[model samples]
Target: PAKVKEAILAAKAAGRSRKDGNLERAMTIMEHAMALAPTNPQILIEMGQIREMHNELVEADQCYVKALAYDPGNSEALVLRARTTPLVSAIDRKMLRSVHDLRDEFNHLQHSTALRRMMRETYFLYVYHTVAIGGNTLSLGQTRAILESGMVIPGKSIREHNEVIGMDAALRFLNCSLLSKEHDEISIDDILEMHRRVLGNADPVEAGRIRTVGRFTPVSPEYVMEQLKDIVDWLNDESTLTIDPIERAAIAHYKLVLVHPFTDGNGRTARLLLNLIMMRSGFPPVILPVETRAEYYASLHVANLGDLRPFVRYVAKHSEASIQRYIGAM
Candidate 1:
């Protein structure tokens, strides 16, 4: 513990130096700290970050891998791994890897409860998150306050409550699938099943069915099936097998959203797919905060125009912060 404490102090000093643009001192402090506590996850994560700052991606990747070995579910380590994740891994996938439970695999979701029980413990915040993704009018904070107070949503009836209910159902399915020993990838039906849960209760007309009409623009309805099949085929491809899991998941999220298969809950379903892919990749789900709604939409807008960096970076930023929050508590 004393070694950890001293290492922590060195890490802090290194952070100060790094922030002050003193790379040499930062690297020196990091070396001294690492010498004392070689297997420290925090120190390893910082070393990875500093290496990244120096454009030493291969070395940074090594640090992150070591940190993950020390603590398999380290969120900071995962985020760095995702950031440095590439088109092709130099090593074999070896079936990727899996950590049991949301606690170990999804540290960022620590505050969320996916399954509903007593009114008090429902996954209401997800309702908030999903509804916002659905382009609902409720502010995230207001939605959050309602959940924390154990009160119902204060709004015009029907779609709002139904969507909240939909959130609970979707989360239940996601958590359940995570706990199951089924195949590693989700089927095409799995996509529709989740959308069914999202809108089934209040709007059965839209549930489990592809949209005949496009929502964002006049996309030819004829192409929906073809495009969706294209997505499935890509996911099932042998080359895709070599893509980093995190990048693969993010790319899937982008592709599904572009297809916009469902009528009413297109965005919500796409967001859910994003989390599902991430969770399956043994990482935590990302929350696109309502506060950054403008930036979120803006990133998507640019992504549609072929600038994928903003969107990918946006997801990475949120993912890192989400994981960092949990690690900070530790």
Candidate 2:
């Protein structure tokens, strides 16, 4: 009993250290607690939290699993395990494996001139399709001209050109600034800045600003900030970090759309956020083609109905396609 009590005290101290940004100190304290109460589920969970903080996901998951073994109905342990564990379905596993293999193949061509050219083509296609899905009027050729030659399409609206330019700017920022660094977590400011660029050229008034008046009505103006904050928190959560990046990206896109944070460019910004998550995991941007616009919205509608599997599977399919597209280009 005294040992258990001492372990609890140690865990409390470790929690404080973790909150204070002393992860190493927290880890050391957790080790002491785990040593004192090896079978204590509480101590195990504390250790898991510390490990998770250190980005040692496998170690953290082991701790959570061990804790669950001791207390089968432990909700905290159960939730932690679900977050850290990969998809259990055999089908999902096979899909994930295939995607990973494709990514591995793509990585082998890193720094090659062919790969660079392929990526440049992909960028143009990505920008074209993403805005096209939002009803931009420019053809892919026109988009390429605008992006590459700075040639304006004479008949197109300025709004259409700006949408292309804005998407391009946002994508560039994502690749050069956000994805270029060692960003472990996506911040609210990052999303805002991305949204800013997405709309800066098209609608400078609403760029980067969360909706103040109800336009979409799915998410009320009052709840937009709260929900957006929730999305950021979920993105940065340890559980979200442990999931497969494709599923993570899909969920991020869905959640952003659900929130409809910005009055304009929500879809474009959501797609950019999706790619930001995917590219961070070494996957190329999963281009949602303008052709698949109906199917894309259908999957999202199905997600809203209850099951997220369809949407996740949709994103995974595109993820696979994106990887294969890169490999095929090479």
Candidate 3:
């Protein structure tokens, strides 16, 4: 509990980094905050958010779970996860995906080939469910809103914490939609746009959702690339990171938003990255539902702004969800 309180302080500190525009520094502090209170709901919630910015969807969701466990009434996690959803059983959705995959595969190709297609579809379906409910709970509107708005048209800002899912998915896909190991259709430029989309005309500029604590921001392209050069280079060097790929993706989302590259769309881009990383790592992609917005943003505020307690525990909770989502799909 004391750790949770400290995590709150860290979250607040990270939030301040946005005002100062020092996301990298904020991230650094977040790492420390997490160390102080590993698996803390608030800190992990913020970590999930930052990781989402970095394309670490599954991880972010895990953070949501930890936060919610500590406070089941936490609207953020309650809604982000489907466990609380009143409609269909997760079992039911899984069966539907199975049928869809099987039918699609059978129709597209012959027996053997069709079977392969089914397996692939089945795999992706498995992936989809896991990450969507990773750390946080989301509502139907939250799920639909993020999916519907998965892409930004360009030169626009995001409205709020819950408004970023769709576009973030787009950016993460773009980030991972590479032609080769070294290139992609959307470069860091697009990533910049992804980051910028999070800002609302009425809201003040905030980088990576961190207000202080750990500083990571992109005030200028040159500076971003300068930092990116190091970050990417480090990522490029991490062969093992590709295992979860989402790990790096999570970090990337965190860092990208911290920079606040574009005028808006940062949150969506980061969230997208979360899914992208999950997919890249052989895990499923996740969709962050709107229900988790309060804890999502608030936890991030604490981690980067000052706290870390909930953030770490948040990971454990959603990690369970993400894994279960994947398992259920099968």
Candidate 4:
């Protein structure tokens, strides 16, 4: 009983230490607390918090699991464990399962002229938002008009019009060419061709070419090709090919963006590649809307911090949305 009281006091001291920005001292104090009250749920939770602060997620999860073992009704432990659990565990199952179910439903739909029109409209919106994410100024209506009728919007820049054209061309190529050969591994040339279609009309000189100079601290231009090759190998790896298709697509998009292989149109081409992967796997294109652009970049920012679960979840959520849209249209 005395040791248990002392453990509570030690946990309080650890809390104070954490507030004072001494995580090392806090962890040491929490370890002592845990030693004194090994089965104490409160003490275990305190220890878990410290480990989480240190970014030791697996250890933090273990502490939470231990807390739950001693006090099965501990809601705090339950929530913390869920938060720290790895994506490969139960965390992604429900979200991914829903997407799979939706994809299957979408696939079973009967093809009709109306369904085809909806897909075309969805493609227009996809092109609009994808280009708009990169600072294009064309409206969705204008984008559709350009894609459908080849009419230019007055007051829009030639570059803006070209972006719309390029995205449409890229999407067409993705659907007609790349998606047709769905089982084949994606190649470096495929990536370049996608980039060429994304930027060809806008910047002829840079289209289809990897960067020769670094911009914004991307992989150095000299090493871009090598890194691109590495990513392609990874994308085509058997293990990667076997993962959940949505996760695979999300990682492919993130890896391409990370490499920044091209001087311009990296984002557009990366997204097209993402859709290529998804569509080939029988899933609809997950459109990253301009409305959620902030969240999109924020998730990518989190991925840059070495945890990709948030970004993967983000893409999965959008994939679910796309699937629902398709189902509703049908």
Q: Each model's C-alpha lDDT?
A: 0.67, 0.82, 0.48, 0.82
Model 4: residue 166 alpha-carbon error in angstroms: 0.6
Per-residue lDDT value at 123 in model 3? 35
Off by over 4 Å in 2: 1-88, 213-223
Give candidate 4's error at residue 16 in angstroms.
9.2
**TM-score per candidate:** 0.58, 0.69, 0.40, 0.73
Candidate 3's TM-score: 0.40
lDDT of 1 by residue, 248-302 (tens): 7668888988777887777888878877766665655567777788888877765
Q: Is candidate 3 or candidate 4 better by lDDT?
A: 4
User: Considering every candidate listed, which one attains the maximal TM-score?
Assistant: 4
Clashes of 2: 0
Off by more than 4 A, model 1: 1-123, 139-155, 213-223
> Which residue pairs collide, candidate 4?
none
Residue-wise C-alpha lDDT for candidate 2, range 250-276, written one tens digit per residue: 889888888778888888999899899
List where candidate 3 sits over 4 angstroms from the true fold. Answer: 1-176, 179-220, 239-247, 305-309, 312-316
